[model samples]
Target chain A: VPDVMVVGEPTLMGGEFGDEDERLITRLENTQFDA
Target chain B: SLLTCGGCQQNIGDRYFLKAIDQYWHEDCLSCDLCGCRLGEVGRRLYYKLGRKLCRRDYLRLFGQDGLCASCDKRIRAYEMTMRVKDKVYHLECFKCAACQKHFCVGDRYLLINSDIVCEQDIYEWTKING
Candidate 1:
């Protein structure tokens, strides 16, 4: 498979999720991609 | 009759008003309006807005404190030139002479343009080109 490039929420994939955790992950991913 | 102070009022022998003329004159009215003398014998007149006494003779002195050749100095005297770079006041010719030769304090005849100040003599030496 090519680079997965997953834009959907990981929580949508059944990983246990909380708003704080989702926000943190989103921020971390965005920052990493930007950098 | 209140004491008439310099620059404070155009007419002397009147009441003292703080907000008159320029702010600098408000604090001290010693210098003459024409000449810059703290002491001179002259009747005082109260200036309308400034509300201070004006000395006729002293007023004249303010024009040429630098003491350079009166002709060249007169041109310099007409404009108020301040040196922000050096935090000093200078005659226009004095500043130009100083900058041209990269020197300081060269004009004689004028106390303000001596060794402590800076300028080139050659540049300022003129023969009354204009009438």
Candidate 2:
């Protein structure tokens, strides 16, 4: 699942040009894994 | 061409206006039905519902129903605030310590225990008992 994932809803996001470097950071912070 | 203003229902005489959702409205007319917050001031988007132009806050409260809450397993209202911690989502009323059921203030320390959030006091006691 994506952060602020929307279906049939007009969504607006504010951020930088996030590449893998940023996406992975937010992903790792939001997802659950072996700790 | 003279188009009727949705808000004031007046003739548009070549003035500042907004065309939203196939409806013609004056710039001063595009406002939320309940709160009267101007759509252009709230955000970049305006949600159309019930034949009315609504801002994000009012639209969600009147016409939106968010998905279920992870803790209480109840429906979360679209306008309601939520707390997400460590990939888990919860309503403000339900995002409390699993052990003590106490609400956390900003900057308060907590731990995730077995997929549950435990406060500092409860976590310490739990660790000691399990150790």
Candidate 3:
């Protein structure tokens, strides 16, 4: 499981752009291959 | 509108402030709970755990799979092969018979005496001598 994070500049609402990147989101969501 | 800073618990009147983990903070107050370094200013990222904000370095150090060797008391890098016994971790070579300093292989019988790894021969000798 991946912890939620902020990328780039942080602002009052959240990150300057948004919460996270879409590609990064998909990568963290993949199932683990290791024990 | 004034927002409350989570760190100082004061009203934020500055034009620039930060928000993380649904909490608002002053720029200078947005720092790791352990190291006290501003997170976003250093790496533009932060990790939150149990209501504490952590920088990448502190986050990995506190929770990641890296730690010091139980035998040598030196730092154990994350990439090296290791042996773990209970809460202690040792390097591959460091994991040996504590009594005789002998190494063991697969299927070798070993004894954990007082938290030290002792081989059967050494332990038997010690038992006879001490008794």
Candidate 4:
């Protein structure tokens, strides 16, 4: 087997404002959107 | 507006649907672009790269290289010639304005906004409008 690319789970997106925005951004930063 | 399948580009009439990349997909239609494995059955983790939804196996096989293109987030193969901006690198085809798809010329002014690139010409207009 080849070297595995370590990637993470799909993120849970939240609404686009205030606390929701913060949650979204937090999830975005923590999760990998690409391979 | 009706929800459409992203893969087949057909209108979905079913009540059950899967959503990814801001698009609705039929359960049968959501398959890996490379190997045709059903993503819904594979796992929750899916990888999107270079305009294709891929499975973990295919993504690692193809894109497990040392470098990733900043524009498309795909593997930068050793054989591929790339363009660079500071520490960021991109495929030649991906070196363009993210919003308008304008290709950058040599010494062209550009800006990196949260990793997405924009041409200087558009950034000025965007700044004015967004401000």
Off by over 4 Å in 2: A1-35, B1-3, B12-15, B61-65, B129-131
Which DockQ values do the candidates obtain, in the order shown? 0.00, 0.02, 0.02, 0.02
Report the lDDT tens digits of candidate 4 across residue range A1-35. Answer: 13112212221111111221111000111122233
B1-131 in candidate 2: lDDT tens per residue?
Answer: 45777778887664355666666776677777888876654343476655766666666666564656668878766666666664565677786778778876666667665446767667667778753
- Count of clashing pairs, candidate 1: 36
Instruction: Evaluate all candidate structures by whole-model CA lDDT and list the values in order.
Output: 0.29, 0.58, 0.58, 0.59
Task: Give the range where candidate 2 chain B is weakest over 10 consecutive residues by summed lDDT.
Answer: B40-49
For B1-131, candidate 3 gives per-residue lDDT tens digits of 34687889997666566666667777787777887886656344676665657665555555555567778888775445566665566777787887789876666666554546766667678667653
The positional error of residue B111 in candidate 3, measured at the CA in angstroms, is 37
lDDT of 2 at B103: 79
Error of 3 at B40 (Å): 2.6
lDDT of 1 by residue, A1-35 (tens): 23111111111111121222110000001111221
Best-to-worst lDDT order: 4, 3, 2, 1
Give the poorly placed runs of model 1, Cα more than 4 Å off.
A1-35, B1-52, B55-58, B61-74, B78-100, B106-131
Candidate 3 displacement at residue B68 in angstroms: 8.5
Q: Kindly list the interface RMSD, in angstroms, of each predicted candidate in the order they appear.
A: 37.4, 18.2, 19.9, 19.1
Global fold similarity of model 4 (TM-score)? 0.38
